[PDB]
CSV table of N, CA and C and ligand atoms in Angstrom, one decimal:
chain,number,residue,atom,x,y,z
A,205,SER,N,-5.0,-2.1,-15.2
A,205,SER,CA,-4.8,-3.4,-14.5
A,205,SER,C,-3.3,-3.7,-14.5
A,206,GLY,N,-2.5,-3.1,-15.4
A,206,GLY,CA,-1.1,-3.5,-15.4
A,206,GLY,C,-0.9,-4.7,-16.2
A,207,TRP,N,-0.1,-5.7,-15.6
A,207,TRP,CA,0.3,-6.9,-16.2
A,207,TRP,C,-0.8,-8.0,-16.1
A,208,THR,N,-1.6,-7.9,-14.9
A,208,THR,CA,-2.5,-9.0,-14.6
A,208,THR,C,-3.4,-9.4,-15.9
A,209,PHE,N,-3.8,-8.4,-16.6
A,209,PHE,CA,-4.7,-8.8,-17.8
A,209,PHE,C,-3.9,-9.5,-18.9
A,210,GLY,N,-2.6,-9.5,-18.8
A,210,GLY,CA,-1.8,-10.4,-19.7
A,210,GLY,C,-1.8,-11.8,-19.3
A,211,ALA,N,-2.3,-12.1,-18.2
A,211,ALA,CA,-2.3,-13.5,-17.6
A,211,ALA,C,-3.7,-14.1,-17.6
A,212,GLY,N,-4.6,-13.4,-17.0
A,212,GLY,CA,-6.0,-13.9,-16.9
A,212,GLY,C,-7.0,-12.8,-17.0
A,213,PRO,N,-8.0,-12.7,-16.1
A,213,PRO,CA,-9.0,-11.6,-16.2
A,213,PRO,C,-8.3,-10.3,-15.8
A,214,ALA,N,-8.8,-9.2,-16.3
A,214,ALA,CA,-8.2,-7.8,-16.0
A,214,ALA,C,-8.6,-7.4,-14.5
A,215,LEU,N,-7.7,-7.8,-13.6
A,215,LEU,CA,-7.9,-7.4,-12.2
A,215,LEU,C,-7.7,-5.9,-12.0
A,216,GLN,N,-8.8,-5.2,-11.8
A,216,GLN,CA,-8.8,-3.7,-11.7
A,216,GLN,C,-7.8,-3.3,-10.6
A,217,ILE,N,-7.0,-2.3,-10.8
A,217,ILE,CA,-6.1,-1.8,-9.8
A,217,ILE,C,-5.7,-0.3,-10.1
A,218,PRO,N,-5.9,0.6,-9.2
A,218,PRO,CA,-5.7,2.1,-9.5
A,218,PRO,C,-4.2,2.3,-10.0
A,219,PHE,N,-4.0,3.3,-10.8
A,219,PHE,CA,-2.7,3.6,-11.4
A,219,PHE,C,-1.6,3.8,-10.4
A,220,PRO,N,-1.8,4.7,-9.4
A,220,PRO,CA,-0.8,4.8,-8.3
A,220,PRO,C,-0.3,3.5,-7.8
A,221,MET,N,-1.2,2.6,-7.5
A,221,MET,CA,-0.8,1.2,-7.0
A,221,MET,C,0.0,0.5,-8.1
A,222,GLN,N,-0.5,0.6,-9.3
A,222,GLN,CA,0.2,-0.1,-10.4
A,222,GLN,C,1.7,0.4,-10.5
A,223,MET,N,1.8,1.7,-10.5
A,223,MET,CA,3.2,2.3,-10.6
A,223,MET,C,4.0,1.9,-9.4
A,224,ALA,N,3.5,1.9,-8.2
A,224,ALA,CA,4.2,1.5,-7.0
A,224,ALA,C,4.7,0.1,-7.1
A,225,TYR,N,3.8,-0.8,-7.6
A,225,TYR,CA,4.2,-2.1,-7.9
A,225,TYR,C,5.3,-2.2,-8.9
A,226,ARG,N,5.2,-1.4,-10.0
A,226,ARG,CA,6.3,-1.4,-11.0
A,226,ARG,C,7.6,-1.0,-10.3
A,227,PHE,N,7.6,0.0,-9.5
A,227,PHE,CA,8.8,0.5,-8.8
A,227,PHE,C,9.4,-0.6,-7.9
A,228,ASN,N,8.5,-1.2,-7.1
A,228,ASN,CA,9.0,-2.3,-6.3
A,228,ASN,C,9.5,-3.5,-7.2
A,229,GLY,N,9.1,-3.5,-8.4
A,229,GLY,CA,9.7,-4.5,-9.3
A,229,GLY,C,11.2,-4.3,-9.6
A,230,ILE,N,11.6,-3.1,-9.5
A,230,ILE,CA,13.0,-2.8,-9.8
A,230,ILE,C,13.8,-2.3,-8.6
A,231,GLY,N,13.4,-2.8,-7.4
A,231,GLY,CA,14.2,-2.5,-6.2
A,231,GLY,C,14.1,-1.0,-5.8
A,232,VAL,N,13.0,-0.4,-5.9
A,232,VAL,CA,12.8,1.0,-5.4
A,232,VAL,C,11.8,1.2,-4.3
A,233,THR,N,11.0,0.2,-4.1
A,233,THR,CA,10.0,0.2,-3.0
A,233,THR,C,8.9,1.3,-3.2
A,234,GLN,N,7.7,1.1,-2.6
A,234,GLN,CA,6.6,1.9,-2.9
A,234,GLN,C,6.7,3.3,-2.3
A,235,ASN,N,7.5,3.5,-1.2
A,235,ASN,CA,7.6,4.7,-0.5
A,235,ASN,C,8.1,5.8,-1.4
A,236,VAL,N,9.1,5.5,-2.3
A,236,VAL,CA,9.6,6.5,-3.3
A,236,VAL,C,8.5,7.1,-4.1
A,237,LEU,N,7.7,6.2,-4.7
A,237,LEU,CA,6.6,6.7,-5.6
A,237,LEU,C,5.5,7.4,-4.8
A,238,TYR,N,5.2,6.9,-3.6
A,238,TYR,CA,4.1,7.6,-2.9
A,238,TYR,C,4.6,8.8,-2.3
A,239,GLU,N,5.9,9.1,-2.1
A,239,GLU,CA,6.4,10.3,-1.7
A,239,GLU,C,6.8,11.3,-2.8
A,240,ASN,N,6.8,10.8,-4.0
A,240,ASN,CA,7.1,11.7,-5.1
A,240,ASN,C,6.1,11.6,-6.3
A,241,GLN,N,4.9,11.2,-6.0
A,241,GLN,CA,3.9,11.0,-7.0
A,241,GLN,C,3.7,12.2,-7.9
A,242,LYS,N,3.7,13.4,-7.3
A,242,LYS,CA,3.5,14.6,-8.1
A,242,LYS,C,4.7,14.8,-9.1
A,243,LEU,N,5.9,14.5,-8.6
A,243,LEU,CA,7.1,14.7,-9.4
A,243,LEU,C,7.1,13.7,-10.6
A,244,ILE,N,6.7,12.4,-10.2
A,244,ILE,CA,6.7,11.4,-11.3
A,244,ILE,C,5.6,11.7,-12.3
A,245,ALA,N,4.5,12.2,-11.9
A,245,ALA,CA,3.4,12.6,-12.8
A,245,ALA,C,3.9,13.7,-13.7
A,246,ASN,N,4.5,14.7,-13.1
A,246,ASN,CA,5.0,15.8,-13.9
A,246,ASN,C,6.1,15.4,-14.9
A,247,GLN,N,7.0,14.5,-14.5
A,247,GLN,CA,8.0,14.0,-15.5
A,247,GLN,C,7.4,13.2,-16.6
A,248,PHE,N,6.4,12.3,-16.2
A,248,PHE,CA,5.8,11.5,-17.2
A,248,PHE,C,5.0,12.3,-18.2
A,249,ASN,N,4.3,13.3,-17.7
A,249,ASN,CA,3.5,14.2,-18.6
A,249,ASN,C,4.5,15.0,-19.5
A,250,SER,N,5.5,15.5,-19.0
A,250,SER,CA,6.5,16.3,-19.8
A,250,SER,C,7.1,15.4,-20.8
A,251,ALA,N,7.5,14.2,-20.5
A,251,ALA,CA,8.1,13.3,-21.4
A,251,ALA,C,7.2,12.9,-22.5
A,252,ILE,N,5.9,12.6,-22.2
A,252,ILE,CA,4.9,12.2,-23.2
A,252,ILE,C,4.6,13.4,-24.1
A,253,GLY,N,4.6,14.6,-23.5
A,253,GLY,CA,4.4,15.8,-24.3
A,253,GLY,C,5.6,16.1,-25.3
B,275,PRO,N,-3.0,3.3,-0.7
B,275,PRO,CA,-1.6,3.1,-0.9
B,275,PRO,C,-0.8,3.0,0.4
B,276,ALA,N,-1.3,3.5,1.5
B,276,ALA,CA,-0.6,3.4,2.7
B,276,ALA,C,-1.6,3.5,3.9
B,277,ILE,N,-1.1,3.2,5.1
B,277,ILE,CA,-1.9,3.3,6.3
B,277,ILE,C,-1.2,4.1,7.3
B,278,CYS,N,-1.9,5.1,7.8
B,278,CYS,CA,-1.3,6.1,8.8
B,278,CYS,C,-1.7,5.6,10.2
B,279,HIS,N,-0.8,5.0,10.9
B,279,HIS,CA,-1.2,4.7,12.3
B,279,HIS,C,-1.0,5.8,13.2
B,280,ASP,N,0.2,6.4,13.4
B,280,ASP,CA,0.4,7.6,14.1
B,280,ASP,C,1.3,8.5,13.3
B,281,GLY,N,0.7,9.4,12.5
B,281,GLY,CA,1.5,10.3,11.7
B,281,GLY,C,2.6,9.7,10.9
B,282,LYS,N,2.4,8.4,10.5
B,282,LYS,CA,3.5,7.7,9.8
B,282,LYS,C,2.8,6.7,8.8
B,283,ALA,N,3.2,6.9,7.5
B,283,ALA,CA,2.7,6.0,6.5
B,283,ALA,C,3.3,4.6,6.5
B,284,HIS,N,2.4,3.6,6.5
B,284,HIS,CA,2.8,2.2,6.6
B,284,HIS,C,2.5,1.6,5.2
B,285,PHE,N,3.6,1.4,4.4
B,285,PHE,CA,3.4,0.7,3.1
B,285,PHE,C,3.6,-0.8,3.3
B,286,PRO,N,3.0,-1.6,2.4
B,286,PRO,CA,3.1,-3.0,2.6
B,286,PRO,C,4.5,-3.5,2.0
B,287,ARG,N,5.2,-4.3,2.8
B,287,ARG,CA,6.5,-4.9,2.3
B,287,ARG,C,6.2,-5.8,1.2
B,288,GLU,N,5.1,-6.5,1.2
B,288,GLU,CA,4.8,-7.4,0.1
B,288,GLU,C,3.3,-7.6,0.1
B,289,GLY,N,2.7,-7.2,-1.1
B,289,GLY,CA,1.2,-7.3,-1.2
B,289,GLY,C,0.6,-5.9,-1.2
B,290,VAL,N,-0.7,-5.8,-1.3
B,290,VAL,CA,-1.4,-4.6,-1.4
B,290,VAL,C,-2.5,-4.6,-0.3
B,291,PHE,N,-2.7,-3.4,0.3
B,291,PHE,CA,-3.7,-3.3,1.4
B,291,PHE,C,-5.1,-3.5,0.8
B,292,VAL,N,-5.9,-4.3,1.5
B,292,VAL,CA,-7.3,-4.5,1.1
B,292,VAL,C,-8.2,-4.4,2.4
B,293,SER,N,-9.4,-4.1,2.2
B,293,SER,CA,-10.4,-4.0,3.3
B,293,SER,C,-11.7,-4.7,2.8
B,294,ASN,N,-12.2,-5.5,3.7
B,294,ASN,CA,-13.5,-6.1,3.4
B,294,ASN,C,-14.6,-5.2,3.8
B,295,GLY,N,-14.5,-3.9,3.4
B,295,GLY,CA,-15.5,-2.9,3.7
B,295,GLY,C,-15.2,-2.2,5.0
B,296,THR,N,-14.9,-2.9,6.1
B,296,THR,CA,-14.6,-2.3,7.4
B,296,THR,C,-13.3,-2.6,8.0
B,297,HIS,N,-12.7,-3.7,7.8
B,297,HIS,CA,-11.4,-4.1,8.4
B,297,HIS,C,-10.3,-4.2,7.3
B,298,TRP,N,-9.2,-3.5,7.4
B,298,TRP,CA,-8.2,-3.5,6.4
B,298,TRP,C,-7.2,-4.7,6.6
B,299,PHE,N,-6.8,-5.3,5.5
B,299,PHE,CA,-5.9,-6.5,5.6
B,299,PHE,C,-4.8,-6.3,4.5
B,300,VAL,N,-3.7,-7.1,4.7
B,300,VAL,CA,-2.7,-7.3,3.7
B,300,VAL,C,-2.8,-8.6,3.0
B,301,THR,N,-2.8,-8.7,1.7
B,301,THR,CA,-2.9,-9.9,0.9
B,301,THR,C,-2.0,-9.9,-0.2
B,302,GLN,N,-1.7,-11.1,-0.8
B,302,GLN,CA,-0.8,-11.2,-1.9
B,302,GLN,C,-1.4,-10.6,-3.1
B,303,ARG,N,-0.6,-10.6,-4.2
B,303,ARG,CA,-1.0,-10.0,-5.5
B,303,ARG,C,-1.9,-10.9,-6.3
B,304,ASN,N,-1.6,-12.2,-6.3
B,304,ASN,CA,-2.2,-13.2,-7.2
B,304,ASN,C,-3.0,-14.2,-6.4
B,305,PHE,N,-3.3,-14.0,-5.2
B,305,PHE,CA,-4.2,-14.8,-4.4
B,305,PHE,C,-4.7,-14.0,-3.2
B,306,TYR,N,-6.0,-14.1,-2.8
B,306,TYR,CA,-6.5,-13.4,-1.7
B,306,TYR,C,-6.4,-14.2,-0.5
B,307,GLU,N,-5.6,-13.7,0.5
B,307,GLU,CA,-5.6,-14.2,1.8
B,307,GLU,C,-5.3,-13.0,2.8
B,308,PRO,N,-6.3,-12.8,3.7
B,308,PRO,CA,-6.1,-11.6,4.5
B,308,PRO,C,-5.2,-11.9,5.7
B,309,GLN,N,-4.3,-11.0,6.0
B,309,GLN,CA,-3.5,-11.0,7.2
B,309,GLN,C,-3.6,-9.7,7.9
B,310,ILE,N,-3.6,-9.8,9.3
B,310,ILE,CA,-3.7,-8.6,10.1
B,310,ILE,C,-2.5,-7.7,9.8
B,311,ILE,N,-2.7,-6.4,9.8
B,311,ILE,CA,-1.7,-5.5,9.3
B,311,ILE,C,-0.8,-5.2,10.6
B,312,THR,N,0.3,-5.9,10.7
B,312,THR,CA,1.2,-5.7,11.8
B,312,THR,C,2.5,-5.0,11.3
B,313,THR,N,3.4,-4.8,12.1
B,313,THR,CA,4.7,-4.2,11.7
B,313,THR,C,5.6,-5.2,10.9
B,314,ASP,N,5.3,-6.4,11.0
B,314,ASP,CA,6.1,-7.4,10.2
B,314,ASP,C,5.9,-7.3,8.7
B,315,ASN,N,4.6,-7.2,8.3
B,315,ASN,CA,4.3,-7.2,6.9
B,315,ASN,C,4.3,-5.8,6.3
B,316,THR,N,4.6,-4.7,7.1
B,316,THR,CA,4.6,-3.4,6.6
B,316,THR,C,5.9,-2.7,7.1
B,317,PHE,N,6.5,-1.9,6.3
B,317,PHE,CA,7.6,-1.1,6.6
B,317,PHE,C,7.3,0.4,6.6
B,318,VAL,N,7.6,1.1,7.6
B,318,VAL,CA,7.3,2.5,7.8
B,318,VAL,C,8.4,3.4,7.2
B,319,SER,N,8.0,4.4,6.4
B,319,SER,CA,8.9,5.4,6.0
B,319,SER,C,8.0,6.6,5.4
B,320,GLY,N,8.0,7.7,6.1
B,320,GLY,CA,7.3,8.9,5.6
B,320,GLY,C,6.8,9.7,6.7
B,321,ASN,N,5.9,10.7,6.4
B,321,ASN,CA,5.4,11.6,7.3
B,321,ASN,C,3.9,11.8,7.2
B,322,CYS,N,3.1,10.9,6.5
B,322,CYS,CA,1.7,11.0,6.4
B,322,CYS,C,1.2,12.3,5.9
B,323,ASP,N,1.9,12.9,5.0
B,323,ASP,CA,1.4,14.2,4.4
B,323,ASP,C,1.5,14.2,2.9
B,324,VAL,N,2.5,13.5,2.4
B,324,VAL,CA,2.8,13.5,0.9
B,324,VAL,C,2.0,12.5,0.2
B,325,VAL,N,1.8,11.3,0.7
B,325,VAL,CA,1.1,10.2,0.1
B,325,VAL,C,-0.4,10.6,-0.1
B,326,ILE,N,-1.0,10.2,-1.2
B,326,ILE,CA,-2.4,10.6,-1.5
B,326,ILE,C,-3.2,9.3,-1.5
B,327,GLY,N,-4.3,9.3,-0.8
B,327,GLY,CA,-5.2,8.2,-0.7
B,327,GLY,C,-5.0,7.3,0.5
B,328,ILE,N,-4.1,7.8,1.4
B,328,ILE,CA,-3.8,7.0,2.6
B,328,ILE,C,-5.0,7.0,3.6
B,329,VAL,N,-5.4,5.9,4.1
B,329,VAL,CA,-6.4,5.7,5.1
B,329,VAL,C,-5.8,5.6,6.5
B,330,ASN,N,-6.6,5.8,7.5
B,330,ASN,CA,-6.0,5.8,8.9
B,330,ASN,C,-5.9,4.4,9.4
B,331,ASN,N,-7.0,3.7,9.6
B,331,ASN,CA,-7.1,2.4,10.1
B,331,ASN,C,-6.2,2.3,11.4
B,332,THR,N,-5.6,1.1,11.6
B,332,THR,CA,-4.7,0.9,12.7
B,332,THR,C,-3.8,-0.3,12.4
B,333,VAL,N,-2.6,-0.3,13.1
B,333,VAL,CA,-1.7,-1.5,13.0
B,333,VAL,C,-1.6,-2.1,14.4
B,334,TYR,N,-1.3,-3.4,14.4
B,334,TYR,CA,-1.2,-4.2,15.6
B,334,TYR,C,0.3,-4.5,15.8
B,335,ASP,N,0.8,-4.2,17.0
B,335,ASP,CA,2.2,-4.5,17.4
B,335,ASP,C,2.2,-5.8,18.1
B,336,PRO,N,2.9,-6.8,17.6
B,336,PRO,CA,2.9,-8.1,18.2
B,336,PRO,C,3.8,-8.2,19.4
B,337,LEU,N,4.4,-7.1,19.8
B,337,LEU,CA,5.4,-7.0,21.0
B,337,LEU,C,4.8,-6.3,22.2
B,338,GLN,N,4.0,-5.3,22.0
B,338,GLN,CA,3.4,-4.6,23.2
B,338,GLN,C,2.7,-5.5,24.1
B,339,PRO,N,1.8,-6.4,23.7
B,339,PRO,CA,1.1,-7.2,24.7
B,339,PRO,C,2.0,-8.1,25.5
B,340,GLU,N,3.1,-8.5,25.0
B,340,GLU,CA,4.0,-9.4,25.8
B,340,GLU,C,5.1,-8.5,26.4
C,657,LIG,C1,-14.0,-8.4,7.7
C,657,LIG,O1,-13.3,-9.6,8.3
C,657,LIG,C2,-13.1,-9.6,9.7
C,657,LIG,C3,-12.4,-10.8,10.1
C,657,LIG,O2,-11.0,-10.5,10.1
C,657,LIG,C4,-14.5,-9.5,10.4
C,657,LIG,O3,-14.4,-9.4,11.8
C,657,LIG,C5,-15.0,-10.4,12.6
C,657,LIG,O4,-13.9,-11.1,13.2
C,657,LIG,C6,-14.3,-12.1,14.1
C,657,LIG,C7,-13.0,-12.7,14.7
C,657,LIG,O5,-13.2,-13.2,16.0
C,657,LIG,C8,-15.1,-13.2,13.4
C,657,LIG,O6,-15.5,-14.2,14.4
C,657,LIG,C9,-16.3,-12.5,12.8
C,657,LIG,O7,-17.1,-13.5,12.1
C,657,LIG,C10,-15.9,-11.4,11.9
C,657,LIG,N1,-17.1,-10.7,11.4
C,657,LIG,C11,-17.7,-11.1,10.2
C,657,LIG,C12,-18.9,-10.3,9.8
C,657,LIG,O8,-17.3,-12.0,9.6
C,657,LIG,C13,-15.3,-8.3,9.8
C,657,LIG,O9,-16.6,-8.3,10.4
C,657,LIG,C14,-15.4,-8.4,8.3
C,657,LIG,N2,-16.2,-7.3,7.8
C,657,LIG,C15,-17.2,-7.5,6.9
C,657,LIG,C16,-17.9,-6.2,6.5
C,657,LIG,O10,-17.5,-8.6,6.5
C,658,LIG,C1,-6.5,10.3,10.6
C,658,LIG,O1,-5.6,10.7,11.6
C,658,LIG,C2,-5.2,12.1,11.4
C,658,LIG,C3,-4.0,12.2,12.3
C,658,LIG,O2,-3.6,13.6,12.3
C,658,LIG,C4,-6.4,13.0,11.9
C,658,LIG,O3,-6.3,14.2,11.1
C,658,LIG,C5,-7.0,15.2,11.8
C,658,LIG,O4,-7.7,16.0,10.9
C,658,LIG,C6,-8.4,17.1,11.5
C,658,LIG,C7,-9.2,17.8,10.5
C,658,LIG,O5,-8.4,18.7,9.7
C,658,LIG,C8,-7.4,18.1,12.2
C,658,LIG,O6,-8.2,19.1,12.9
C,658,LIG,C9,-6.6,17.3,13.3
C,658,LIG,O7,-5.6,18.1,13.8
C,658,LIG,C10,-6.0,16.1,12.6
C,658,LIG,N1,-5.2,15.3,13.6
C,658,LIG,C11,-5.8,14.7,14.6
C,658,LIG,C12,-4.8,13.9,15.5
C,658,LIG,O8,-7.0,14.7,14.9
C,658,LIG,C13,-7.7,12.2,11.7
C,658,LIG,O9,-8.0,11.6,13.0
C,658,LIG,C14,-7.7,11.2,10.6
C,658,LIG,N2,-7.9,11.9,9.3
C,658,LIG,C15,-8.3,11.3,8.2
C,658,LIG,C16,-8.4,12.2,7.0
C,658,LIG,O10,-8.6,10.1,8.2
């Protein structure tokens, strides 16, 4: 759900959308994430590993 | 995540795309209000190949009829 559940009910929202929203939060716009989703996933998995 | 009108991904400038089953709309994040998906509320950047989960639907140009 992202942040929504910290405010009221847990509004279900798929992770891609949640991350695109987070990117738009910091002035990057959704197109960056939806054109690099595989790269972001690889970087996140590598960092968490 | 995006709408492909003609080989071009249309991401929402503000809000997330929603569909009432059959017709897709743009609405805010913390309140539901459907608006027709025009070029005003969406900005195009891409090639409709890399984004995953994109649906086709259609967009309405408010300038072509006039
Ligand atoms: C989703 O909403 C749209 C409205 O944007 C529905 O399309 C019809 O739109 C006309 C506009 O002239 C209305 O008069 C109709 O009442 C709308 N139909 C309905 C069933 O409300 C569209 O049908 C809606 N889809 C669903 C599955 O409810
Ligand atoms: C959405 O529009 C695209 C636009 O290209 C279409 O994709 C077609 O997919 C078939 C099946 O592989 C191909 O043979 C065609 O060449 C593609 N293009 C066209 C213009 O038909 C299709 O209309 C829609 N596809 C989806 C997945 O919604």
